Curated annotation (Swiss-Prot):
Region (Interaction with ubiquitin): 10-15, 149-157, 219-228
Similarity comment: Belongs to the peptidase C12 family.
Protein name: Ubiquitin carboxyl-terminal hydrolase YUH1
Site (Transition state stabilizer): 84
Domain UCH catalytic: 7-233
GO cellular component: cytoplasm
pH dependence, record text: Optimum pH is 8.5. Inactive at a pH below 6.5.
Highest rank taxon of the organism: Eukaryota
UniProt GO BP: protein catabolic process; ubiquitin recycling; ubiquitin-dependent protein catabolic process
A Pfam family of this chain: Peptidase_C12
This protein's UniProt keywords: Hydrolase, Protease, Thiol protease, Ubl conjugation pathway
Organism: Saccharomyces cerevisiae (strain ATCC 204508 / S288c)
Function of the protein: Deubiquitinating enzyme (DUB) that controls levels of cellular ubiquitin through processing of ubiquitin precursors and ubiquitinated proteins. Thiol protease that recognizes and hydrolyzes a peptide bond at the C-terminal glycine of either ubiquitin or RUB1. Preferentially cleaves ubiquitin from peptides and small adducts.
Length: 236
């Protein structure tokens, strides 16, 4: 048995490392990742040639986080979820929830395309992390990154950064906007219906006030490692 989970995971590496693993996951060439400076100054979305297809936040779990209220949400909703079992998958599961939550940009025969089909061929629904074959797609592709091909950063110093970053990615569907926080064993956590002025996904004031809620629960040391990222059409 080869080595595993001794690797480090991607922090402050938003541009390069995300386009590498996502392309091996099956992401078409017409789409890629690209970093985000701001989302509340309208001067940034004034420089956008095409609408971004998804967004994700990079912010750590502070010890307060009283904005959370654990309750049993619906499990038959129009969208999907997975459990963060393996901890070293902080780079994997972040890109997984960006890709699977928009099945429309996948390529027929890719790893994600056959991962959706293999769960409907087994005791899972289509997304439920509860069967052995659902975990096989996770443990074999991460094996290519715990080897000497060190994802995130070189020399694999620790399991994570000097802090405990978290990864929450989602999109708007059926006229509303929600989130995918894989820390919740209960399921997803809705924000409310989408704005009538949402320019593409950046101007969504609902998710912007939720980022502003986490930084009030955090100290000045915990907001230090804060960045944002997205997945829109490629620009090359």
């Amino acid at each position: 048995m080869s080595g595993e989970n001794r690797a480090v995971v991607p922090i402050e590496s938003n541009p390069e490392v995300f386009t590498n693993f996502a392309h091996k996951l099956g992401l078409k060439n017409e789409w890629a990742y690209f970093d985000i400076y701001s989302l509340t100054e309208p001067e940034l979305l004034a420089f956008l040639p095409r609408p971004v297809k998804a967004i994700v936040l990079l912010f750590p779990i502070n010890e307060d986080r009283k904005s959370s209220t654990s309750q049993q949400i619906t499990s038959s909703y129009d969208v999907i979820w997975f459990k963060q079992s393996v901890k070293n998958a902080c780079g994997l599961y972040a890109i997984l929830h960006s890709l699977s939550n928009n099945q429309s940009l996948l390529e027929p025969g890719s790893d994600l395309d056959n991962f959706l089909k293999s769960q409907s061929d087994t005791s899972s629904s289509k997304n439920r992390f509860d069967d052995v074959t659902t975990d096989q797609f996770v443990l074999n592709v991460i094996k290519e990154n715990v080897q000497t091909f060190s994802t995130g950063q070189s020399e694999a110093p620790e399991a994570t950064a000097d802090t405990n970053l978290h990864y929450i990615t989602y999109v708007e569907e059926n006229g509303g906007i929600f989130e995918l926080d894989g820390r919740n064993l209960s399921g997803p956590l809705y924000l409310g219906k989408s704005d009538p002025t949402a320019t593409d996904l950046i101007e969504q004031e609902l998710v912007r006030v939720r980022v502003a809620s986490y930084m009030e629960n955090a100290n000045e040391e915990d907001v230090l490692n804060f960045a944002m990222l997205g997945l829109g059409p490629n620009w090359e």
